[PDB]
């Protein structure tokens, strides 16, 4: 609607905001909210023992779930910038941005790899 981009009013993340970041964050929140439910639906679907009609219904429900319920849709962005390439998980930062931070001394224990 007009007052918000997505259906649910989620907060903005602190520090660097970006449109893509906003999109990702919301998606992550919705996944967190509807994680157990999705799992339960998946279980009901992939069951040889249960009634077939019920499993079909569960599968249909899973199919009909939105873009923001999907775990696979989540992509690890850089947190300092808003890039989504070469994003290292141990400091949620992009390649160049990580290097910049590392050389400054922002990182907790990172330093030049001399051998």
């Amino acid at each position: 609607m007009g007052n918000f981009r997505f259906p649910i009013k989620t907060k903005l993340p602190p520090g660097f905001i970006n449109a893509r970041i906003l999109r990702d964050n919301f998606k992550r929140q919705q996944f967190k909210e509807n994680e157990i439910l999705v799992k339960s639906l998946k279980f009901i679907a992939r069951n040889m023992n249960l009634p077939t009609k019920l499993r079909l219904e569960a599968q249909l429900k899973l199919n009909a779930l939105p873009n923001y319920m999907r775990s696979t849709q989540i992509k690890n962005r850089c947190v300092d910038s808003g890039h989504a390439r070469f994003v290292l998980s141990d400091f949620r930062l992009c390649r160049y941005q990580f290097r910049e931070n590392a050389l400054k001394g922002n990182l907790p224990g990172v330093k030049k790899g001399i051998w």
């Binding site: 141990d90 400054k104 001394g105 922002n106 907790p108």
Partner: protein
């Protein structure tokens, strides 16, 4: 010979002669190279802490500039903060 051995055993001092060490007044602790002085076993938590610290730095920077009834704007300059994360307390 015994006396010499005893000396050798106890031979320590501040480095910088020509049995010696760099004292805490003679060099920087490598912890004072980094700005978030922390170790946590859960690395997610450590990352979250260092993010927080970075966000607080910005907030501090923002605070540092004052105004006096739109007459004088005294811009207090501040260094980059250094966050000391002991088990008990942050400093």
């Amino acid at each position: 010979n015994n006396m010499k051995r005893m000396l050798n055993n106890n031979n320590m001092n501040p480095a910088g002669a020509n049995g010696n060490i760099n004292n805490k007044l003679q060099h920087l602790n490598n912890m004072n190279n980094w700005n978030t002085q922390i170790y946590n076993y859960n690395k997610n938590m450590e990352i979250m802490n260092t993010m927080n610290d970075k966000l607080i730095n910005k907030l501090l920077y923002k605070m540092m500039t004052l105004k006096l009834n739109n007459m004088n704007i005294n811009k207090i300059i501040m260094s980059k903060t250094i966050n000391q994360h002991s088990l008990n307390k942050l400093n």
